[PDB]
């Protein structure tokens, strides 16, 4: 029932409610900033390899606030 996870709309960081379609969580690493949105459990994992067969270690968890590391 709703994930709350960060997305970020520039530079912004913001607890936003998703549907139960985006059960997951996006966060991708930059060298720079850092990627965060609310992400369907399979879409986010098919999004993770895309992104981390560049080279942008990435990480779909469930949890409110998951998209996070170096926090």
Known sequence: MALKCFTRNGDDRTVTTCAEEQTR???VQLPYSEIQECKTVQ??????EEV???????KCCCEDLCNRSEQ
């Open 52 to 58: 981390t067969a560049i080279g942008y270690p990435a």
């Open 43 to 48: 879409q986010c994992a098919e999004v993770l």
């Open 25 to 27: 969580c996006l966060f």
